[PDB]
From a paper:
We also determined crystal structures of unliganded RM018 and RM038, whereas RM017 did not crystallize. Beyond the HCDR3s, RM018 also exhibited extensive glycan interactions with the heavy chain framework regions (FR) 2 and 3, as well as CDR2s, similar to CH04 but with the heavy chain and light chain positions reversed. Our finding that RM018 had a binding mode sharing features with CH01–04 bnAbs prompted us to revisit the idea of targeting this class of Apex bnAbs.
We found that adjuvanted protein or mRNA-LNP immunization of rhesus macaques with ApexGT6, an Env trimer engineered to bind Apex bnAb precursors, consistently induced Apex bnAb-related precursors with long HCDR3s bearing bnAb-like sequence motifs. Cryo-electron microscopy revealed that elicited Apex bnAb-related HCDR3s possessed structures combining elements of several prototype Apex bnAbs. The primary hurdle to eliciting Apex bnAbs is believed to be the low frequency of bnAb-precursor B cells possessing a long (≥ 24 amino acid [aa]) and acidic HCDR3 that can penetrate the glycan shield and bind to the positively charged surface within the Apex epitopic region.
Numbering used by the authors:
A (entry chain L): 3 to 9, 11 to 27, 27A, 27B, 27C, 28 to 95, 95A, 96 to 210
B (entry chain H): 2 to 52, 52A, 53 to 82, 82A, 82B, 82C, 83 to 100, 100A, ...
Write the structure that this text describes.
């Protein structure tokens, strides 16, 4: 099993802990529970091993514990560099290795910045190809969590929408793009289309028309 | 000390992929090597491992029959071949070496296996294995015509990546190159826009250079109001 909280957030300088729940043969069965820190696009790094050991080079902030079938990873004096996913691991009967889901630790080290949304209609050159792709671009916002909803004539439309996951920009902001793929007939069948991006309760709307 | 992993590999469904994990800086045979897989935007997954000296393999039931972990100590390299590849098998493949040896001479110079050590300490850079039936295809660049904003749409291309540069590398201010989106057709689509003065729309010509090494395609596109 190795169930973990989906994500955890805290302020810098404040302690933060993670939970790692398991069965009798997973965590409580053996004292080989270890925690890993993985930054995006990088290999995971071992922070704690054998439940509470801390391999050489790990800052004394990280500390592992265990009480029954649940382990815990605690990061006191939380810093910005501690922003990454954390996984727990543990041996199991039958000579097996089990992993946890992973917790997304975010340090609120930046002020709230609303997203910048631009909407592009299907290009006539693209329409000649029998494809009407609406491109919605979100950039320069923090924290990197937004929700995008597509409206056609103020009516919601969830058909054929794919939105990329937010990433890290050079300025430590976040970026994301949403594409509404319509047929040429559909793009012209509605007066206008809207791309609403909601960020921290604040929502921004940008609309286009076939014109 | 190090686990040198292979490059990047892309395979069709039903095919086979054999990954290699070459170690340096320690005695290869005694230390145990396990393979951990992490699907894009997903949690780590355990596959198996091997002790090279005695060639003992321990697989995960999720991969029994397909995965085959081996090792040629002649070259201190361990190989994990996954057969019957699937679109769902796309993921980043890691190999890790334990903190300490899994086999030890004990006096009487006979061998003695250590006990259930930690086993994930030294990681390799990882290899991406994108298993999909989509074949190599060049992008179709479409202009996104226009404080004014304009950009290029790079649609229906495969596989990664495509490099976009405006004015053949000249314009490099206020330019966002968003991540690509993998659609249900299996072909990535990417967008790139710039922020330029409204007055210069009719005076400065903006060209986006799209390059795609996988399909040996280079495109130059002009965006005008």
């Amino acid at each position: 099993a190795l169930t973990q909280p989906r994500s955890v957030s805290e302020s810098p300088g404040q302690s933060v802990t993670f939970s790692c729940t398991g069965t009798s043969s997973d965590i409580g069965g053996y004292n080989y529970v270890s925690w890993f820190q993985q930054h995006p696009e990088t290999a995971p790094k071992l922070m704690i091993y054998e439940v509470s050991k801390r391999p050489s080079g790990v800052s004394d902030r990280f500390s592992g514990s265990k009480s029954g079938n649940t382990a815990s990873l605690t990061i006191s004096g939380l810093q910005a560099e501690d922003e990454a996913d954390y996984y727990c691991s543990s041996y199991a009967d039958s000579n097996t290795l089990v992993f946890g889901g992973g917790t997304r630790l975010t340090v609120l080290g930046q002020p709230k910045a609303a997203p910048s949304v631009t909407l592009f209609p299907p290009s006539s050159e693209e329409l000649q190809a029998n494809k009407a792709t609406l491109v919605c671009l979100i950039s320069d916002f923090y924290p990197g969590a937004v929700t995008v909803a597509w409206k056609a004539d103020s009516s919601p439309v969830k058909a054929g929408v794919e939105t990329t996951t937010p990433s890290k920009q050079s300025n430590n902001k976040y970026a994301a793009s949403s594409y509404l793929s319509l047929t040429p007939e559909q793009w012209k069948s509605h007066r206008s289309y809207s791309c609403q991006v909601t960020h921290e309760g604040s929502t921004v709307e940008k609309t286009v028309a076939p014109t | 000390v190090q686990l040198v992993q292979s490059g990047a590999e892309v395979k069709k469904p039903g095919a086979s992929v054999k990954l290699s994990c070459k170690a340096s800086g320690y005695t290869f045979s005694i230390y145990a090597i396990t393979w951990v897989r992490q699907a894009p935007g997903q949690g780590l997954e355990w596959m198996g491992g091997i002790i090279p000296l005695v060639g003992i393999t321990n697989y995960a039931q999720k991969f029994q029959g397909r995965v085959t972990i081996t090792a040629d100590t002649s070259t201190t390299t361990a190989y994990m071949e996954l057969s019957s590849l699937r679109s769902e098998d796309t993921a980043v493949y890691y190999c890790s070496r334990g903190l300490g040896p899994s086999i030890e001479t004990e006096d009487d110079y006979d061998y003695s296996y250590t006990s259930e050590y930690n086993l994930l300490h030294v990681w390799g850079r990882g290899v991406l294995v994108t298993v999909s039936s989509a074949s190599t295809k060049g992008p179709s660049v479409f202009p996104l015509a226009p404080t004014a904003a304009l950009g290029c749409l790079v649609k229906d291309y495969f596989p990664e990546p495509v490099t976009v540069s405006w004015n053949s590398g000249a314009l490099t201010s206020g330019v966002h190159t968003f991540p690509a989106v993998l659609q249900s057709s299996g072909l990535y689509s990417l967008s790139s826009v710039v922020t330029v003065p409204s007055s210069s729309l009719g005076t400065q010509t903006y060209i986006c250079n799209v390059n795609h090494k996988p399909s040996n395609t280079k495109v130059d596109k002009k965006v005008e109001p």
